[PDB]
Amino acid sequence: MERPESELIRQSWRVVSRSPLEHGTVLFARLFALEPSLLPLFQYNGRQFSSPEDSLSSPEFLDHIRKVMLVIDAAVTNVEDLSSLEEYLTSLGRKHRAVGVRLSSASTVGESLLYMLEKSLGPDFTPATRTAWSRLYGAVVQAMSRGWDGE
Numbered sequence: 001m002e003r004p005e006s007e008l009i010r011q012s013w014r015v016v017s018r019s020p021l022e023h024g025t026v027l028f029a030r031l032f033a034l035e036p037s038l039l040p041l042f043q044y045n046g047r048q049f050s051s052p053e054d055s056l057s058s059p060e061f062l063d064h065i066r067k068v069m070l071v072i073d074a075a076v077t078n079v080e081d082l083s084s085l086e087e088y089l090t091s092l093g094r095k096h097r098a099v100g101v102r103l104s105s106a107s108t109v110g111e112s113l114l115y116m117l118e119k120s121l122g123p124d125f126t127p128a129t130r131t132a133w134s135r136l137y138g139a140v141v142q143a144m145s146r147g148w149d150g151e
């Protein structure tokens with residue numbers, strides 16, 4: 001990533017990273033509002049969530065959110081050279097395959113991330129901040145898709 005984009009990403013992540021579950025909760029609430037057909041993909045204790053709010057009562061799901069936020073934090077930490085996370089991210093792509101999940105829904109998850117950032121940052125969500133994040137998310141997804149497919 002470019003050296004100005006890198007700083008915008010670090011500075012913007014700071015407030016989010018202080019309360020990662022509260023913020024991931026926004027991300028996932030937004031996700032299920034946009035695309036409730038993703039809700040059945042998250043199954044714990046042999047059961048489907050009926051409503052999006054049901055997910056937010058599941059300690060397994062909230063623990064899932066914490067994992068997501070930890071991986072985003074890792075991409076932020078390595079933003080100036082994401083090749084250091086390449087092999088992890090390819091492994092993450094394989095995992096999405098292993099559980100029977102394809103990644104054509106990646107753009108919606110991305111929009112959900114950007115939504116959470118916009119709401120957290122308010123006026124500090126500049127256009128430059130948005131494009132930095134979209135570029136980081138894209139690079140993450142492209143590494144994940146390598147692992148999902150051959151390689």
Ligand code: HEM
Nearest residue numbers: 041042043064067068071072095099101103104105106109
């Ligand atoms: C592309 C659309 C996506 C869908 C539909 C999706 C869905 C899922 C599902 C269903 C699981 C399994 C949950 C479980 O049984 O506990 C999972 C795991 C995971 N997802 Fe995603 N996901 C997507 C993209 C992403 C992206 C872009 C990230 C980036 C941080 C991410 C991070 C994770 C992590 C960290 C796990 C847990 C990995 C592990 O336990 O080893 N996902 N995802």
